[PDB]
Amino acid sequence: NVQAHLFVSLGTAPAIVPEAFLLPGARFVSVHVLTTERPDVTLIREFFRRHAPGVNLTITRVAGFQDLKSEEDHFRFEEVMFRWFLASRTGPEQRFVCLTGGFKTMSAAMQKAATVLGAAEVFHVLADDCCVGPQGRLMPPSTLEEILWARDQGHLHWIRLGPERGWPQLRRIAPEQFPLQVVEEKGDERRVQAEDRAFGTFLQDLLQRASRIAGAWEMLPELPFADLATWSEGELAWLREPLDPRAPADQRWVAGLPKIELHCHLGGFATHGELLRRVRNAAENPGKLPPLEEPRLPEGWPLPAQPIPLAEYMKLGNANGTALLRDPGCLREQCRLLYRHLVDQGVCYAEVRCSPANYAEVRSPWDVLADIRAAFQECMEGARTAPGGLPACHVNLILIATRRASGDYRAAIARHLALAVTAAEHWRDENACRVVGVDLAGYEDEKTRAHYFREEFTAVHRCGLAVTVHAGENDDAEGIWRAVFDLNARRLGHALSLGQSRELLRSVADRGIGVELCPYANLQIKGFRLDGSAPGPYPLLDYLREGVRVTVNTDNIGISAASLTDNLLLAARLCPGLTRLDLLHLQRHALETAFCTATQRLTLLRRISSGIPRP
Amino acid sequence: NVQAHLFVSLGTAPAIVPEAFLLPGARFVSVHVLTTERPDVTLIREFFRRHAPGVNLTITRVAGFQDLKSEEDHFRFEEVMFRWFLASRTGPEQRFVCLTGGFKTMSAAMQKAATVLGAAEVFHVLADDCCVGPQGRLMPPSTLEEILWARDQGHLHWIRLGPERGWPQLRRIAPEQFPLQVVEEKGDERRVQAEDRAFGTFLQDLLQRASRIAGAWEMLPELPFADLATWSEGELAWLREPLDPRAPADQRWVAGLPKIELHCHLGGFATHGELLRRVRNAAENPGKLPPLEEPRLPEGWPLPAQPIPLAEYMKLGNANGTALLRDPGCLREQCRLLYRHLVDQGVCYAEVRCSPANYAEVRSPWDVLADIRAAFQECMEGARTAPGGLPACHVNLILIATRRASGDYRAAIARHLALAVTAAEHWRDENACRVVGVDLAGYEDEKTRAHYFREEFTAVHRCGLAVTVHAGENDDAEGIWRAVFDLNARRLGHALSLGQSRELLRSVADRGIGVELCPYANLQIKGFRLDGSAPGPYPLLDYLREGVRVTVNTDNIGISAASLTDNLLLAARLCPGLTRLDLLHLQRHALETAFCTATQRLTLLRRISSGIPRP
RNA sequence: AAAAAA
């Protein structure tokens, strides 16, 4: 029932096409022959005209491939041959290829094309010297009665080297993508040419990807992303030695790495430098704007010699936040600048934390939250880059419930929780900015631990909203235990005091509770030894080794005055021996621990896997 | 600096090896030539005698290949050629392949071997017509001085096709496992033979596996296991279609599939049939053993016509349990039978639940727990099958905290919690039976829900022990919520009422809390519509589509009188349209939600991926 | 059985 096409080459010796045609036990249609525009193809024409009028064969000649002097003529022949294979709409069960005729290059390339595209059968035809001619014992010449005599007396062999399968993504391809130009067109004969050197690269890197996947098919689950498997021994080993923050090549590598952000405060981005001026000169009511005050930073701020406690750390960001973001224009420009910075950093997903109730003096906190989400959504729709028509960076909101040492803050906590619940129930579109969780931040001690806040978080847990808590910054492992088991937090922020309790670490690893580490905030607040030269060692390596889902974030960009790439670089700095594979593991942990739907999680996994650059 | 070995084929036309040896720039050593038996090789011998002493060329001729009449001699030549390539301790970096010489098939096989094994360079020679010969316009057959004359004025081309990479698995290999046989030996010439056509199959199915991986690479994240991506389009399409429990092929495949057990009761295995008698005839004191009475099973017990209550379900297993297992010999025999059943069922991991406090009359419950674990450990050590010296089935212990409608049961639950904590702190070896979690089992109601037990459970949360709870079988989603959030349960048992509340389902899916469903026990107790022909539909399909982590188990094997395979078949029956990919998803969910270390998780995942049978 | 099926 199959059409059973014939694909054959032709050289200076004609009559190979006709003998290849009458293969036993197979009726053929549309035999296609390839030549090199030196030899004549008349004999096959008269044979098929007199002995098989329903074959409608074609002859293809190759673009001034006169004779084999160099390499490039062979390469153009191979490319035109591959495009000629593609040009006929033929299934794998229809192609019958004979690697006979002409140069051995043509035969070997035909065998390679058959084994790559999965031809239905490959065969070689032989004839016996049964002709008198001018001198006896001659191969059968052009004339047709002698070739029929050679057939019916049994002087042909037809060795066939079995069927082939071929690549699955290269079985059909598309005969509209790779084109064949016809320099001269005439009745049942064409001379073709390929404008570009395209299919060679496609075949080469497809076979390369197959070889690399086969080479690293083992230990694939240990990889964080599937697409790392197509990286060869050299680049796999390149991703195994410890990171070198000094090298500009490593810095360029980290900068181009797609990144996932989870610990980000909207109120600590534009506090110093020109960004603060850009946010100040956008207010709707500049008359009542507070006077421009720049808080002084300690000497050597990004790498301070002496740690500073939390109160001065909060006071560093007094230039921005509640004092400045009351005006709608300032908040809108702050949101736009934050999105621009996130996209410039290469972040494919971020979760910005905001406290709209602190920005309500005449407009409601609901109005502030609506304005923030509207600014984020409009800036999302503005930047419609990336494949699939998806936003370049996807940002979700987390409401902040902040706690103070003294004063009135519980009413604020209740208001934030109710607003977060209502906002989560309001916006449910998957491809849009949403409120995905709540936070428990602020001053922490024995008397403001997580277990004092169960009763109002009962409503949030009933609603089914994600919860994250600040714990371990200024508290021992008891605070982390209260946050994990009495408040049921899904992610912990700055869990530096987790290593004291082995059982707590085992529990946090086993239930898959995420842990967020900000190297700049931890270094500036608690202080850590740099480059291996008593706060204790930075716990990133221990957390990774013990299996707990750890991630690196930025905390306050403006207060710390650096971005996520700088945080990753100094995370490598704090722990000697940290590897780029560990950075990819942190990326996978952040992707898996983030607050997003399963489909969006798969989309981000695919995007990050296919967006990893190469050394 | 490399050695630059050469591999060149020879036909009936000599003086191509001398032309292949001459290369513009490359210093060659140990030229190797492959030939049939009849054609002359003397000319290359004299050429390397008087022009290259330190070259030590070798000639190898195929034993039974002189003129090809069929494909068998081509195949034996193919195999012996691959064995000859492997027989030289050489790498790709110094391998130079020349395809000049012989049939078109030999050149094609030469290029295929070069591109598979990988070579530093593949090429071949072309000769312009230089010598006059006996008739008009010949080209050099012989006359090595004339060959040098053609060389120094340049009528030879040496078309340099290019370099190959080759598959990493077959770069080096070793000729010892794929050797050659020398039929005769004299000088540097040898006639060789290969016993079996084994390397051809190895290369063929290696390339086949590469094709399977390339075809399913895009959908790898959706696949439960990486090894499932090497199954071809036919087996993938077979797997995607819905399961048919009627077909014996499907039943055989489900039986052969490796399984993970998470819900098995040690007190409900040997209750009826010959297993009961086998347990009974092992007691240390048969005289004090109670009489033999079996409760009558309802009509059509495995598929009862009507739903049944829980009290008579408990009474149905009165032949085994506290009435029989208080004897140490009976308990040890029961553990041995349970392990043998688990191994026969194909289980590679199970967690058996026990209540040692119910088996203490003269011996402490600690003695019962120690005896049970010792029996399981000796069963493990006896059956040290499987690769890596790892036991065929790994069994962990989960203590049961029983709830009663009325009476004295809180002392028992306190005993069980303390015993579980002490047993967890006793045994800590990774590759051995351990007490890994606790249960909250027994009758429950509005006044016997989970949240009343928090004061009892905080200790087992402080010591770092996993907790699982029964809920949802005779109550609404409120018990599920209190178990998830007030007790921090990591797995829920029989959560059939979870579908009513969307918020709790989303919370359970987000937090990744495992859900264990037993189709036989649920069908018997609650009753459900079979084959789509009011308790509502069975929630397996809805749970899988919603993303919640669900598993299928056996509950009480003896009481239900069925195994894991029957449970999976009935799970398919209860949800028409259930596909085999959903079964693999269930196995992956059970693997991930099991209470075990990360290394054990990786080993279990890799062995389950490599242990899935094909259709 | 290299520039053109043994």
Ligand SMILES: Nc1ncnc2c1ncn2[C@@H]1O[C@H](COP(=O)(O)OP(=O)(O)OP(=O)(O)O)[C@@H](O)[C@H]1O
């Ligand atoms: N790294 C941190 N550790 C602890 N608390 C933090 C940290 N970063 C920010 N916070 C707290 O987060 C709360 C909310 O901050 P937000 O980002 O909304 O800025 P803000 O409105 O300018 O802050 P503030 O209330 O200090 O004026 C603030 O009370 C701040 O104390």
Ligand SMILES: Nc1ncnc2c1ncn2[C@@H]1O[C@H](COP(=O)(O)OP(=O)(O)OP(=O)(O)O)[C@@H](O)[C@H]1O
């Ligand atoms: N399907 C079920 N649902 C709820 N509880 C169950 C179920 N099956 C068993 N249990 C409870 O599990 C606890 C332990 O059962 P196990 O079979 O290990 O012991 P046993 O000696 O058979 O129990 P018992 O003395 O209650 O008959 C018992 O309290 C039983 O009530």
Ligand SMILES: [Mg+2]
């Ligand atoms: Mg502030």
Ligand SMILES: [Zn+2]
């Ligand atoms: Zn924070």
Ligand SMILES: [Zn+2]
């Ligand atoms: Zn049970």
